[PDB]
Amino acid sequence: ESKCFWRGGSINTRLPFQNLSPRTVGQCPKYVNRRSLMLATGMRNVPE
Amino acid sequence: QVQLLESGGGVVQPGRSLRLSCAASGFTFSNYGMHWVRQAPGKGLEWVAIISFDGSKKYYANSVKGRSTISRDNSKNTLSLQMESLGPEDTALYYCAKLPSPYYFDSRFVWVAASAFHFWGQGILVTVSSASTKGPSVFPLAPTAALGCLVKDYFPEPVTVSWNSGALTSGVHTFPAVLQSSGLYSLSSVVTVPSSSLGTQTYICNVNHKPSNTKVDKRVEP
Amino acid sequence: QVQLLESGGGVVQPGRSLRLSCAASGFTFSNYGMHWVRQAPGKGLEWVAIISFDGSKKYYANSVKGRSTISRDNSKNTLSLQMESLGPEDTALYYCAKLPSPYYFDSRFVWVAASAFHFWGQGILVTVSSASTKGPSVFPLAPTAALGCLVKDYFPEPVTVSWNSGALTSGVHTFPAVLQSSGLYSLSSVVTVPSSSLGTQTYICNVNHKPSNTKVDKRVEP
Amino acid sequence: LFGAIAGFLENGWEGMVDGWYGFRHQNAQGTGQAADYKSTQAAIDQITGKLNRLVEKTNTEFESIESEFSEIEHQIGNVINWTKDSITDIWTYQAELLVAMENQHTIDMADSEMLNLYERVRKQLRQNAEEDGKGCFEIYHACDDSCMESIRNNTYDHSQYREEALLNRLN
Amino acid sequence: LFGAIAGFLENGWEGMVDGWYGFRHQNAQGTGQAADYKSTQAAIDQITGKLNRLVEKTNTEFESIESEFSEIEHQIGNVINWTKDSITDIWTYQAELLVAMENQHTIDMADSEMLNLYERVRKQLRQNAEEDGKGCFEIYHACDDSCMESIRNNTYDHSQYREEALLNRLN
Amino acid sequence: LFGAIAGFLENGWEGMVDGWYGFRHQNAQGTGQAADYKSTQAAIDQITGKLNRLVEKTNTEFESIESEFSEIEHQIGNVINWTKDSITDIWTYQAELLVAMENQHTIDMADSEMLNLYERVRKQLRQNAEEDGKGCFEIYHACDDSCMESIRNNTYDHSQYREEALLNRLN
Amino acid sequence: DKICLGHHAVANGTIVKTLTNEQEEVTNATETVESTGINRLCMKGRKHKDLGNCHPIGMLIGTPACDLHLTGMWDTLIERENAIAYCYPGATVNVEALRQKIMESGGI
Amino acid sequence: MLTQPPSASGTPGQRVTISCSGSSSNIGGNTVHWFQQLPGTAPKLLIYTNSLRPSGVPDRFSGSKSGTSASLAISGLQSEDEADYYCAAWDDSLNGQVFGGGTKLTVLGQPKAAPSVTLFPPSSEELQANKATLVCLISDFYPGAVTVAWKADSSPVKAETTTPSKQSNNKYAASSYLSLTPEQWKSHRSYSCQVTHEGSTVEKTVAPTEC
Ligand SMILES: *[C@@H]1O[C@H](CO)[C@@H](O)[C@H](O)[C@H]1NC(C)=O
Ligand SMILES: *[C@@H]1O[C@H](CO)[C@@H](O)[C@H](O)[C@H]1NC(C)=O
């Protein structure tokens, strides 16, 4: 089951951004040209 | 994903010990701290026990403190609970489940996540009494219109009812059980249908009772 | 913008003193703190000295501490370095340059900027030895195919080689120098060409040697 | 930026898997380690709330305006390409901004919670000890393992050791 | 997040309508309440400046590109619908982000002003009292109503009670 | 907002061109001035990193959809004008938001670094001096120029003057 | 006696981008840009109708290749690349608008 | 003094990484820098403040700093990026900038054809300076693993030059110069240069003759 489609198939994800195609149909996330965008889930890592 | 197995149910007499055990799959069990909760018949929720992911501390509930014992094994992915001196206040449905708990009862891998792994599976329905495990007695309630089946005089009550092997589900009404003066319960289950097919269709009701290995099938006719 | 001038190179004998001086333009020199670095022939980078924009502190490197002296003048936009007792460990290329340094070595005007004014210009190539500044000897290496020129038996080695006044740059290979048992170096430089123009074109190689004022030109033929 | 995570604490405790902000003590009994529940749970709840507000999106239904198997008119096709590329650039910039700001805020919020727990422990150890600066607390008299738990349980009483600390600091 | 509003102050003062950050004292005279003007005015000015920069908008003139009483060509109508729905989604996301960030910043700015006023009062009461942690100040000698106003007027002198406090803490 | 730049420091030092956060001392030798390297370099590095992440942009290639020397169809021209003006307004709003937020964050980050350096110097001067509030440190015994540099070099030892300060404060 | 404070860390940290630092190390982080999809058309829970070698115009005009799709109901219409619209050669005026109208519809 | 990992290898578009470690006296605590030295020319600044780049640096390059260790990454590398790469950092105790050892990287070159071996006899004017030199060069080959054996009348001698990778094709080039005196040059008749390179089957031999 899915709710978003494009020329190459389906998109099943909870992320708000994708870099597959700017032409999508349905309830899809917004296309971004950035290859990667890492969100921090922790504090500064201070090695020993 | 959400697939489980539970064991330990049946009819245990008061004074003896109950032992329940649930094992889940589809995920990494060795990290989620698990909980045992009980719900008395009718309504009302009362928490029983909690366990860490490694079994460091139990912190039993005062209602069953020092009387029950919860344990877990991460190798076989199993969670067991053992309780003794089963009074009438212990007849309830026991659910093993993963609830939102303190963080150190869980592992560091699922802290950074908004998934909130949800559970609660099925029930157990432990009952304590003078066992007397009886077999059910089925009677067809025969005449828009309706028709049904009545199952009476059996114990315990993990009973299920279906219409044509579980096909017809529209307009059906499965009513709660009624306990009477002989330590036995009853239950009616009806289904509606327009008043044009009295002697036309094959209406069959099926009743399954687990702690008697009883499978009954009946047909309705004018 | 990026235009400079450097002076102080040549052949200095061991024991005497070297004096280098670089002056840049195209920007405000009176604010950027400047650095002197050295690189021994081959590879390996070793920092020499740093100076403030006003000359408050030097903080020489321990390898040349108390032996060298760096100075700067902001009126004429010049940076000089003087060193004595030039052992063999001082024969290297000396670069004056602006590097990312502590903030107070620079001025408050370029703190609030992401420009990161970049430099390092050209080299100096100081050499210390029994001078014996020799003139180069050129021989034409004559026969797809190739042809080249070999320059041998001279000192020092700030040598440059071009093909037809610096026009042909495709398929050319300028090889590093080789020192031999007479305190003299050699260097080959070749260029490739398909095997159809042996006696057809005017192939000329030019060799420039600065610390002998030597300009040699040679032609290749079968 | 607070001076806790990137300030006076010059080293992290990789061996402290009990939580994000915990205690390490060395007394006559030996060396021990524990973790504070309140600050860790606060940080976890804030991060999970961020993620929950982030992952939800209704994504109003859209349909196809460009044909994939036939040729579109050149001018309207160029207009559609221009519009969609502009929308792509806008969403890319907003994604960059959101990611960077949220990462900065998460790191600084962890730092703020660390400093708040530090101030709580200091208000508990008000007049019986001193802070050396490197996140440690130079206790001037003593502290038992039960005293350590009382510091964890936020039940440490300073009027019980106040005169002792004063007499130890004077003499 | 600072440890003042959501930290060590575990209760708000609903009865303190005099301001956002005020003083409540209990001395031999009785119980009294006042409010600090500086922090309250700073918070009010910052919030009003936020609102002023928010409510102003020139809103460059726009005109109608879609007809309301006649039928538009299907392809250009679909293009206009797509563009306008994309613009709607963009503005909706930006509105959500702006509202959330501004609310977070306003709450944390109120917290920061509370902690700054706390530090000001502490620098005033430097060496003559101690802070119990729950926002209160355990004065070790005394404070008159005039002393309370001097604490409000930022004129409290600690060298006047320093030796008194030292003698009371030693003996 | 922290109470350092817009709080208890009621005056800036225009004559302090040595850095953003420096020391000014007055001892028996006379008056002297220096600057702290760590906080100034931290602020400079953060601001330069902001500028570096700001000035970089690939700016995906675009082409002309409107003719400059001929007349375009009226409806598609109105659609293009509407779209481009909407994009202009969106980018204008985002520019305003980015500029305002970044300026606020830069000012408050300078303030935070000032307060962090203040707390570092306080952890160094733990038990031998007191802070009068106006950014100064009332040293109770003394401090040489070498002592001042030791405060700069983060090497000041308080156990060397602890008993001296205690005896001076008691007697 | 002595008690110290500190935070935790990991050996293999995760690099994230912030407003002040392009490369900041943190604990286990999360990616926000999706880069992989499914090479399938998940139609479970959707009454799909695959046209195959049939073109939307052939459903209205009645081409042979659309004899299976002259009428019907659907919540998602799927068009293919080999969609034939004309058995007899020809063209359609404003074919893009009609194709959009048909693909947006849910029955004929 | 910083660490000196001498060499890194990779392929076009592989995102190779070079590390630079140290102590709190140099790394800290402090900022590191990176430079690129194209073979034969002057260096160009690439990375400052451990993550920032000047104008003329494409976004394919990137730097980092993890605690007391830094690293350099190159995402979109191609044939025009084979060069020298050094590390740099300011030292706390040593009041100055202390550098690393350096790194010479070379892309994985597909094995080109056997080099354009061309034997060169010494010219008539070279012998006039009481010296002789027989040049036997080999250009446009890969890799650098090769061994040339001289045979003075089928007899070896006892007691060469090579350029780095080309900016466009990563082609190497070697050239040997056997130098003798006129008494030792006119004493032999047949000179030949063999090769045992890893890109050919058997030893290729080219030989000139006197007059
Ligand atoms: C990080 O944790 C998530 C779950 O929180 C897990 O899915 C992922 O594989 C982890 N990644 C790493 C690199 O540890
Ligand atoms: C500010 O400094 C910049 C360089 O950082 C300079 O270009 C500019 O002219 C200066 N402006 C003023 C008003 O000082």
Residue numbers in the entry:
A (entry chain A): 278 to 325
B (entry chain H), C (entry chain H): 1 to 52, 52A, 53 to 82, 82A, 82B, 82C, 83 to 100, 100A, ...
D (entry chain B), E (entry chain B), F (entry chain B): 2 to 172
G (entry chain A): 11 to 118
H (entry chain L): 3 to 9, 11 to 27, 27A, 27B, 28 to 95, 95A, 95B, 96 to 106, ...
How do the authors describe this structure?
HA is synthesized in an inactive form (HA0) and then processed by intracellular proteases to an active state, which consists of an apical globular head domain (HA1) responsible for mediating receptor binding and a stem domain (HA2) that harbors the fusion machinery. We recently reported on the discovery and in vivo efficacy of the VH3-30-derived bnAb 3I1427.
The sequence diversity in IAV is exemplified by the presence of 18 HA serotypes, which can be further divided by phylogenetic relatedness into group 1 (including H1, H2, H5, H6, and H9) or group 2 (including H3, H7, and H10). The structures of the HA proteins in each complex are similar to those of the apo structures, which have been previously reported. The H10 structure has clear density for the C-α-backbone for both the HA and Fab portions; however, side-chain residues are not well resolved and some density is missing near the fusion peptide. Therefore, our description of the intermolecular contacts is based only on the H3 and H6 structures.
